[PDB]
Design an enzyme around this catalytic site. Sequence first.
Site, PDB file in Angstrom:
ATOM      1  N   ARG A  54      11.551   2.842  -1.951  1.00  0.00           N
ATOM      2  CA  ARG A  54      10.549   3.449  -2.819  1.00  0.00           C
ATOM      3  C   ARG A  54      10.909   4.897  -2.912  1.00  0.00           C
ATOM      4  O   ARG A  54      10.948   5.593  -1.888  1.00  0.00           O
ATOM      5  CB  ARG A  54       9.171   3.264  -2.207  1.00  0.00           C
ATOM      6  CG  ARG A  54       8.067   3.988  -2.995  1.00  0.00           C
ATOM      7  CD  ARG A  54       6.731   3.742  -2.316  1.00  0.00           C
ATOM      8  NE  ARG A  54       5.638   4.422  -2.989  1.00  0.00           N
ATOM      9  CZ  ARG A  54       4.631   5.021  -2.364  1.00  0.00           C
ATOM     10  NH1 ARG A  54       4.576   5.034  -1.027  1.00  0.00           N
ATOM     11  NH2 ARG A  54       3.619   5.545  -3.065  1.00  0.00           N
ATOM     12  N   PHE A  59       8.583  13.983  -5.315  1.00  0.00           N
ATOM     13  CA  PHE A  59       7.626  13.636  -4.273  1.00  0.00           C
ATOM     14  C   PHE A  59       8.374  13.359  -2.975  1.00  0.00           C
ATOM     15  O   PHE A  59       8.409  14.217  -2.080  1.00  0.00           O
ATOM     16  CB  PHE A  59       6.734  12.465  -4.728  1.00  0.00           C
ATOM     17  CG  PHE A  59       5.672  11.981  -3.757  1.00  0.00           C
ATOM     18  CD1 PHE A  59       5.313  12.743  -2.649  1.00  0.00           C
ATOM     19  CD2 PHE A  59       5.019  10.780  -3.976  1.00  0.00           C
ATOM     20  CE1 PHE A  59       4.327  12.286  -1.769  1.00  0.00           C
ATOM     21  CE2 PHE A  59       4.063  10.299  -3.062  1.00  0.00           C
ATOM     22  CZ  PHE A  59       3.716  11.068  -1.974  1.00  0.00           C
ATOM     23  N   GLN A  62      11.410   7.123   0.414  1.00  0.00           N
ATOM     24  CA  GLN A  62      10.881   6.312   1.517  1.00  0.00           C
ATOM     25  C   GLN A  62      11.821   5.159   1.874  1.00  0.00           C
ATOM     26  O   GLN A  62      12.446   4.534   1.021  1.00  0.00           O
ATOM     27  CB  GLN A  62       9.515   5.750   1.090  1.00  0.00           C
ATOM     28  CG  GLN A  62       8.778   4.978   2.203  1.00  0.00           C
ATOM     29  CD  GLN A  62       7.437   4.519   1.745  1.00  0.00           C
ATOM     30  OE1 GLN A  62       6.821   5.067   0.810  1.00  0.00           O
ATOM     31  NE2 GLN A  62       6.878   3.544   2.453  1.00  0.00           N
ATOM     32  N   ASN A 101       2.717   4.934   6.981  1.00  0.00           N
ATOM     33  CA  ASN A 101       1.770   4.145   7.769  1.00  0.00           C
ATOM     34  C   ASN A 101       0.842   3.390   6.867  1.00  0.00           C
ATOM     35  O   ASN A 101       0.841   3.609   5.659  1.00  0.00           O
ATOM     36  CB  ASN A 101       1.013   5.052   8.787  1.00  0.00           C
ATOM     37  CG  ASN A 101       0.079   6.015   8.145  1.00  0.00           C
ATOM     38  OD1 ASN A 101      -0.727   5.643   7.275  1.00  0.00           O
ATOM     39  ND2 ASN A 101       0.161   7.279   8.526  1.00  0.00           N
ATOM     40  N   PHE A 112       9.597   8.758   5.505  1.00  0.00           N
ATOM     41  CA  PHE A 112       9.949   9.350   4.209  1.00  0.00           C
ATOM     42  C   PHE A 112      10.459  10.741   4.415  1.00  0.00           C
ATOM     43  O   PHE A 112      10.205  11.393   5.437  1.00  0.00           O
ATOM     44  CB  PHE A 112       8.760   9.310   3.231  1.00  0.00           C
ATOM     45  CG  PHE A 112       7.495  10.013   3.670  1.00  0.00           C
ATOM     46  CD1 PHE A 112       6.624   9.402   4.568  1.00  0.00           C
ATOM     47  CD2 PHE A 112       7.183  11.293   3.214  1.00  0.00           C
ATOM     48  CE1 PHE A 112       5.438  10.021   4.949  1.00  0.00           C
ATOM     49  CE2 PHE A 112       5.975  11.895   3.581  1.00  0.00           C
ATOM     50  CZ  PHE A 112       5.133  11.275   4.467  1.00  0.00           C
ATOM     51  N   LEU A 121      -0.847  15.242   2.831  1.00  0.00           N
ATOM     52  CA  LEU A 121      -0.583  14.223   3.862  1.00  0.00           C
ATOM     53  C   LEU A 121      -0.789  14.780   5.254  1.00  0.00           C
ATOM     54  O   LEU A 121      -0.770  14.021   6.222  1.00  0.00           O
ATOM     55  CB  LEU A 121       0.841  13.689   3.699  1.00  0.00           C
ATOM     56  CG  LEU A 121       1.152  13.069   2.326  1.00  0.00           C
ATOM     57  CD1 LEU A 121       2.621  12.596   2.252  1.00  0.00           C
ATOM     58  CD2 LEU A 121       0.171  11.926   2.008  1.00  0.00           C
ATOM     59  N   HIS A 125      -0.234  11.681   8.185  1.00  0.00           N
ATOM     60  CA  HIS A 125       1.088  11.152   8.523  1.00  0.00           C
ATOM     61  C   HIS A 125       1.725  12.047   9.544  1.00  0.00           C
ATOM     62  O   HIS A 125       1.590  13.275   9.452  1.00  0.00           O
ATOM     63  CB  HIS A 125       1.972  11.114   7.272  1.00  0.00           C
ATOM     64  CG  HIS A 125       1.458  10.136   6.250  1.00  0.00           C
ATOM     65  ND1 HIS A 125       1.978   8.848   6.170  1.00  0.00           N
ATOM     66  CD2 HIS A 125       0.424  10.221   5.393  1.00  0.00           C
ATOM     67  CE1 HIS A 125       1.248   8.191   5.273  1.00  0.00           C
ATOM     68  NE2 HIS A 125       0.309   8.990   4.756  1.00  0.00           N
TER      69      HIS A 125
HETATM   70  O1  LIG Z   1       4.035   3.261   1.905  1.00  0.00           O
HETATM   71  C1  LIG Z   1       3.396   3.697   2.826  1.00  0.00           C
HETATM   72  N1  LIG Z   1       2.685   2.964   3.687  1.00  0.00           N
HETATM   73  C2  LIG Z   1       2.468   1.514   3.522  1.00  0.00           C
HETATM   74  C3  LIG Z   1       3.581   0.659   4.111  1.00  0.00           C
HETATM   75  C4  LIG Z   1       3.665   0.546   5.629  1.00  0.00           C
HETATM   76  C5  LIG Z   1       4.029   1.635   6.421  1.00  0.00           C
HETATM   77  C6  LIG Z   1       4.213   1.502   7.785  1.00  0.00           C
HETATM   78  C7  LIG Z   1       4.045   0.267   8.387  1.00  0.00           C
HETATM   79  C8  LIG Z   1       3.681  -0.859   7.610  1.00  0.00           C
HETATM   80  C9  LIG Z   1       3.525  -0.686   6.240  1.00  0.00           C
HETATM   81  C10 LIG Z   1       3.506  -2.243   8.227  1.00  0.00           C
HETATM   82  C11 LIG Z   1       4.442  -2.319   9.453  1.00  0.00           C
HETATM   83  C12 LIG Z   1       4.059  -1.178  10.406  1.00  0.00           C
HETATM   84  N2  LIG Z   1       4.301   0.144   9.772  1.00  0.00           N
HETATM   85  C13 LIG Z   1       2.602  -1.292  10.868  1.00  0.00           C
HETATM   86  O2  LIG Z   1       2.450  -2.473  11.686  1.00  0.00           O
HETATM   87  C14 LIG Z   1       1.659  -1.407   9.656  1.00  0.00           C
HETATM   88  O3  LIG Z   1       2.144  -2.372   8.731  1.00  0.00           O
HETATM   89  C15 LIG Z   1       3.358   5.161   3.169  1.00  0.00           C
HETATM   90  O4  LIG Z   1       2.754   5.600   4.150  1.00  0.00           O
HETATM   91  N3  LIG Z   1       4.096   5.912   2.333  1.00  0.00           N
HETATM   92  C16 LIG Z   1       4.182   7.370   2.542  1.00  0.00           C
HETATM   93  C17 LIG Z   1       5.201   7.946   1.548  1.00  0.00           C
HETATM   94  C18 LIG Z   1       4.539   9.228   0.973  1.00  0.00           C
HETATM   95  C19 LIG Z   1       3.037   8.912   0.977  1.00  0.00           C
HETATM   96  C20 LIG Z   1       2.850   8.081   2.246  1.00  0.00           C
END
Ligand SMILES: O=C(NCCc1ccc2c(c1)[C@H]1C[C@@H](N2)[C@H](O)CO1)C(=O)NC1CCCC1
Length: 164
Positions: A54, A59, A62, A101, A112, A121, A125
Amino acid sequence: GNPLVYLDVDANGKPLGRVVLELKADVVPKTAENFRALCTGEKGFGYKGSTFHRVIPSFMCQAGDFTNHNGTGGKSIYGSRFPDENFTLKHVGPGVLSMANAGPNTNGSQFFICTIKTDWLDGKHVVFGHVIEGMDVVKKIESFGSKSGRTSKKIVITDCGQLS
Ligand SMILES: O=C(NCCc1ccc2c(c1)[C@H]1C[C@@H](N2)[C@H](O)CO1)C(=O)NC1CCCC1
């Protein structure tokens, strides 16, 4: 001291170069150690062969979902998720390395690299390092993204490891 790690990235099978990251073990040791070990692959799994799935220009880029390759997976060296260590470091500008997360206390392996200041953020984060060199390679990855986050070329971390 703090670890220096690297990611070698390809776009459609051709090298873009190397991104070198400092991991702030001095502030977030557990978070830095997870990323360091996922770069070496020393626990039997890690980032080698996985993608930047992604990428949103102006921005962030990721990556880190080496289990599902689609943004739903990844895992930490500790287990499937681990707590937010602290929010001491902030998203101050391009080059910040931070954990993705799915809400509080859900760090895994996704991460990212910011291409702008993402201060919205902060406190949500965990920031755990920054780009030391290869910001030009991050900008090449960024160029293959889109506003939707879908990439126009397959962006792969072909190799990764620790420099010191
Ligand atoms: O896309 C984003 N988050 C959703 C995807 C996500 C991220 C971490 C994790 C998981 C899923 C799975 C596996 C593991 N860790 C944990 O067990 C939770 O479930 C996310 O924060 N993007 C960032 C990029 C900029 C804005 C924020």
